[PDB]
């Protein structure tokens, strides 16, 4: 919750309009935010199971990033 | 489509030839030209030999 | 820094030491001097007019003429090789190798 909370506000000025629930940021920073969120999830897996991150195939990274039972 | 005012062409045309056949026809055409000009000039010293 | 002895050791011979207003022009004394030499030969670039400077004037080969213009007809040849069309290249190049 903690570091993903601080990722989704990448600036000091990253307002959300009241009738929306996720932040309002451009698509360039949407793909930037998505890259650092998937790096968060992969780092948490590599710290949880003590596994080297770059050893994984992309099907394996797919199965972790959607949370497949591995 | 303008079927009336499109630049026409006929079926089974075979198309316009490449550069080699075109300038070979140019050389044969120019041969016929010079032959008929010396024929009109009635030149008795023009000879064409065994190899063109 | 130089002296005159090194100075005439440096230079070739054939040389001796020793608002505003509107009016008009007139018809000139035909300021139409040659800047590129007298033939078809090639174009000369502005840097090549020291090396091929002797071609911008016509010799009219007598009274400036030992055999030396035969030994600077090679100037014409180097110009034809260096800056010419490839027929002119191989013509001048065969000519200079044959002589």
């Amino acid at each position: 919750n903690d570091r993903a909370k601080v990722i989704l506000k990448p600036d000091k000025t990253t307002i959300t309009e009241p009738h929306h629930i996720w932040p309002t940021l451009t698509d360039e920073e949407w793909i930037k935010v998505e890259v650092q969120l998937k790096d968060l999830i992969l780092a948490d897996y590599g710290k949880k199971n003590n596994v080297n991150v770059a050893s994984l195939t992309q099907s394996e990274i797919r199965d972790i990033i959607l949370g497949m039972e591995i | 489509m303008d079927f009336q005012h499109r630049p026409g062409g006929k079926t089974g045309s075979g198309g316009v030839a490449s550069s080699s056949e075109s300038n070979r026809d140019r050389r044969e055409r120019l041969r016929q030209l010079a032959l008929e000009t010396i024929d009109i000039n009635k030149d008795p010293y023009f000879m064409k030999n065994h190899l063109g | 820094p130089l002296s005159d002895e090194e100075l005439d050791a440096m230079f070739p011979e054939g040389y001796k030491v020793l608002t505003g207003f509107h009016m008009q022009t007139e018809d000139r004394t035909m300021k139409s001097v040659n800047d590129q030499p007298s033939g078809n030969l090639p174009f000369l670039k502005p840097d090549d007019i020291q090396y091929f400077d002797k071609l911008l004037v016509d010799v009219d080969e007598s009274t400036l003429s030992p055999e030396e213009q035969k030994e600077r007809k090679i100037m014409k040849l180097l110009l034809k090789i260096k800056n010419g069309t490839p027929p002119m290249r191989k013509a001048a190049l065969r000519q200079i190798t044959d002589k």
Binding site: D2, R3, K5, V6, L8, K9, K12, T13, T14, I15, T16, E17, P18, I21, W22, P23 | - | -
Partner: protein
């Protein structure tokens, strides 16, 4: 010797944005309605009504005095230019800035070129 300082800065701003703040900040937020009320926002006639002149205090990162006011060249990493940085270089920051601006221009031409007969 100062990247660690900025790591401390980003961790303390990380702590304040994490442990107490909710996930979304709205337009009110009680912090950005301090920053709108504290912007420069050039074109204020009352600027010299309150300021005397653009003077100099001990305005530096460390208490040691900062560099004076000539123009340090722009150099892609905003520096602690101090103690006589008078513009000697092999000329590379200017080179790479011109290079990337040329890249950003030729992509603008490449779009136009690509999209013509569509």
């Amino acid at each position: 010797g100062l990247a660690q300082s900025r790591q401390q800065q980003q961790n303390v701003e990380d702590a304040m944005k994490e442990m107490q703040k909710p996930l979304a900040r709205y337009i009110d937020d009680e912090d950005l309605d301090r920053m709108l009320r504290e912007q420069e926002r050039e074109g204020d006639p009352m600027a010299n009504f309150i300021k005397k002149n653009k003077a100099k205090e001990n305005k530096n990162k460390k208490v040691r005095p900062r560099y004076s006011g000539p123009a340090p060249p722009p150099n892609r990493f905003w520096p602690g230019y101090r103690w006589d940085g008078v513009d000697r270089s092999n000329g590379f920051e200017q080179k790479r800035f011109a290079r990337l601006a040329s890249k950003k221009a030729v992509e603008e031409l490449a779009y136009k070129w690509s999209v013509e007969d569509m």
